[PDB]
């Protein structure tokens, strides 16, 4: 009968019923003492892995998954799927959307073979593609996630889906439609309990495309208001700080730029997950402060985190439009070869 309650805790982990998850967990701390059924124990271990992905405990999550990898051979297809999913979200929280995308896709095909369906999975894959810049796949999966969430009344997720498709629009064109969507979000992100985060990211994005249009006087405003409402340090924070540094360096105001970028790099220095957002910040410092120094000095350590990469390679030869002769054409061959 404990298996059914384990399924109940699974369902609680799906719908993110935090207090229910917590109390059922506290019940399981005493319930899981007399079982020894192996499969039930592993079920509890993996559902506890989900408990860890809910509590944002990265270290304990990775450690638990490493302790759980050794017995991955004995898992049932469901437990296999749970391990793949948990691993995927683990490397997702570590800002490694490559492995994240891999494990998420494998979890997707496993779920499609098993006949299991979670809208959250599709949303996570769409988000993975979104983090990997411009994608038709992002929209493709965010639409399935859209239908699923609309079927499950998961409005709070649908909002983030709209943010996803909006972001996918912004990286090409449709700045008009993007502004319509975002402005429609700002007025609807007030009927929530977690308004501040939505307002922050949406203001950062709309400020980014107001910066992209050529109207930066409003961009600095929206960025300022975005910083005003953030109460934590994540990838989005370093991102909007970076963008703030952009709208600052273009507006000639170089002092706020140097302060924002020094603060950005130093703040990104602590967390090892922020490095992916750190190693680009310093690049902005290269185009404005050190200046005309041998790029490959900082680029030899920037060659690895590059696995918008084509924009970086193009920029690596956009600065060398004054020189000759083979290296330019070679970089052209490189970017063209990576275009497909």
């Amino acid at each position: 009968d404990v298996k059914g309650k384990l399924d109940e805790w699974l369902n609680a982990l799906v719908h993110l019923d935090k207090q229910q998850v917590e109390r059922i967990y506290e019940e399981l701390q005493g319930e899981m003492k007399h079982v020894l059924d192996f499969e039930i124990i592993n079920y509890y271990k993996l559902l506890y892995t989900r408990y860890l992905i809910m509590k944002r405990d990265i270290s304990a999550l990775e450690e638990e998954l490493d302790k759980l990898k050794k017995v991955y051979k004995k898992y049932s297809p469901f437990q296999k799927l749970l391990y793949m999913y948990g691993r995927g979200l683990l490397c997702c929280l570590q800002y490694r959307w490559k492995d994240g995308l891999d494990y998420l896709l494998k979890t997707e095909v496993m779920a499609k073979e098993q006949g299991y369906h979670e809208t959250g999975l599709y949303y996570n894959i769409a988000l993975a593609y979104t983090h990997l810049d411009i994608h038709h796949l992002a929209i493709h999966f965010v639409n399935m996630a859209l239908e699923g969430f609309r079927s499950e009344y998961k409005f709070r997720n649908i909002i983030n889906c709209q943010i996803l498709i909006a972001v996918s629009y912004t990286e090409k064109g449709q700045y008009e439609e993007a502004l319509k969507m975002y402005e429609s979000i700002l007025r609807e992100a007030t009927s929530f309990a977690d308004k501040d985060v939505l307002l922050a990211i949406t203001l950062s994005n709309m400020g980014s495309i107001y910066y992209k249009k050529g109207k930066y006087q409003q961009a600095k405003k929206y960025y300022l208001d975005s910083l005003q409402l953030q109460k934590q340090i994540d990838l989005n924070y370093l991102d909007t700080i970076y963008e703030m540094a952009l709208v600052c360096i273009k507006l000639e105001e170089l002092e706020e730029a140097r302060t924002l970028i020094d603060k950005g790099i130093d703040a990104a220095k602590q967390e090892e997950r922020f490095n992916a957002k750190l190693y680009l910040l310093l690049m902005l410092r290269y185009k404005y402060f050190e200046e005309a120094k041998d790029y490959k000095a900082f680029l030899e350590n920037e060659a690895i985190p590059l696995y918008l990469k084509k924009v970086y390679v193009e920029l690596a030869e956009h600065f060398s439009s004054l020189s000759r002769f083979e290296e330019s054409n070679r970089y052209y061959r490189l970017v063209i070869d990576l275009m497909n």
């Binding site: 992905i53 809910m54 943010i163 990286e171 990211i201 950062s204 991102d239």
Partner: peptide, 8 residues
Amino acid sequence: SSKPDIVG
């Protein structure tokens, strides 16, 4: 561009 958060 800032992005929303993971489900979980």
